[PDB]
Design an enzyme around this catalytic site. Structure first.
Site, PDB file in Angstrom:
ATOM      1  N   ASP A  26       8.503  47.427  13.276  1.00 52.90           N
ATOM      2  CA  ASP A  26       8.382  46.678  12.029  1.00 52.90           C
ATOM      3  C   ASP A  26       7.803  47.582  10.942  1.00 52.90           C
ATOM      4  O   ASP A  26       6.818  47.250  10.281  1.00 52.90           O
ATOM      5  CB  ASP A  26       7.531  45.423  12.223  1.00 52.90           C
ATOM      6  CG  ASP A  26       7.751  44.396  11.128  1.00 52.90           C
ATOM      7  OD1 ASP A  26       8.813  44.444  10.472  1.00 52.90           O
ATOM      8  OD2 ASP A  26       6.860  43.546  10.918  1.00 52.90           O
ATOM      9  N   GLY A  53       0.102  40.262   4.803  1.00 52.48           N
ATOM     10  CA  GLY A  53       0.897  39.600   5.818  1.00 52.48           C
ATOM     11  C   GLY A  53       0.051  39.096   6.968  1.00 52.48           C
ATOM     12  O   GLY A  53      -0.532  39.889   7.713  1.00 52.48           O
TER      13      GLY A  53
END
Ligand SMILES: *CCC(=O)Nc1cc(C(=O)NCc2cn(C3CCC3)nn2)cc(-c2n[nH]c3ccccc23)c1
Length: 282
Positions: free
Chosen positions: A140, A28
């Site tokens: 997150d 990511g």
């Protein structure tokens, strides 16, 4: 201090050309896999372009600020050093095997509880360290942010949204806030069920908003009882997946949970199990 690599207990005066680029890595988001020519160490080097996105570069500098001051935590990915060139900034992170998301794909099935036990103790102490030592909230938490290596270590990844997230693991009170470290406890619980069963809890969802409706309308997805899961494991997931955020426990009582206290002292060979799973690959 920049321009110095600190692998282990030795500091080497390094330069950008002292690192041999071995190709980019998939994660990511631009992280490179490089080899220090003076030592032979393989390290992860993320390159922040000076002319890059101001919003993306802001997220890169935020996590580096947390990573640099998280050197005394053994459950956070460490930074070996930084290189500030005229046009780029190179952050030298330690090199690890993969993330829990990709490990779920290669496994093509559930992850053993004994591996998730060591993972649970690691992520909780990592989030607890952020809230206490720096007042940092991850916001997150998901399998893509849980790293592993050959030596059996399990560490936390990168907090580009941390404050002093993905809608699939978002807490119920983050969707409908009344009038918050306990929001990541839900994200951790959803990540545990996904890895313990090999399936995402809220399946058959073609819309991010549809995932939000199932979090609030349906009961929290606990672990199945026909897979041999221990009572302490199911008690930990049920406590993490409490819809009312006021009743959801904080990291203080989570550390005092019997499931955590088991795998703190238990000797689980995560190193050998990691090499066997990565051996069977496409
Ligand atoms: C969720 C995706 C993810 O975690 N991706 C990721 C992959 C790799 C990776 O594949 N590294 C290659 C590699 C090479 N080896 C052997 C070669 C001798 C050492 N082992 N793995 C790496 C990382 C990763 N590792 N540390 C990191 C820090 C910060 C971000 C990513 C990262 C991630």
């Amino acid at each position: 201090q920049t321009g110095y690599l600190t692998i282990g207990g030795q500091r080497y005066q390094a330069e950008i050309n002292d690192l041999e680029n071995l190709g980019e890595m998939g994660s990511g988001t631009q992280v490179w896999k490089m080899r220090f020519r003076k030592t032979g160490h393989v390290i992860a080097v993320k390159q922040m372009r000076r002319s890059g996105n101001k919003e993306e570069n802001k997220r890169i500098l935020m996590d580096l600020d947390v990573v640099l001051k998280s050197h005394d935590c053994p459950y956070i990915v460490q930074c070996f050093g930084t290189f500030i060139t005229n046009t780029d900034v190179f952050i030298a992170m330690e090199l690890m095997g993969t993330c829990a998301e990709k490990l779920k794909k290669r496994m093509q099935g559930p992850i053993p509880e004994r591996i998730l036990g060591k993972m649970t103790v690691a992520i909780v102490k990592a989030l607890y360290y952020l809230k206490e030592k720096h007042g940092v909230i991850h916001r997150d938490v998901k399998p893509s942010n849980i790293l592993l290596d050959e030596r059996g270590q399990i560490k936390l990844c990168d907090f580009g949204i941390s404050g002093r997230g993905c809608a699939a693991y978002m807490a119920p009170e983050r969707i409908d806030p009344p009038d918050d470290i306990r929001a990541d406890v839900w994200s951790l619980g959803i990540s545990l069920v996904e890895l313990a069963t090999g399936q995402f809890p809220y399946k058959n969802c073609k819309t991010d908003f549809e995932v939000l409706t199932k979090v609030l309308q349906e009961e929290p997805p606990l672990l199945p009882g026909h897979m041999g899961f221990s009572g302490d494991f199911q008690s930990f997931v049920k406590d993490c997946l409490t819809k009312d955020h006021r009743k959801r426990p904080k990291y203080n009582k989570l550390l005092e949970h019997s499931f955590i206290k088991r795998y703190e002292t238990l000797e689980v060979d995560v190193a050998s199990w990691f090499k066997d799973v990565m051996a069977k690959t496409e």
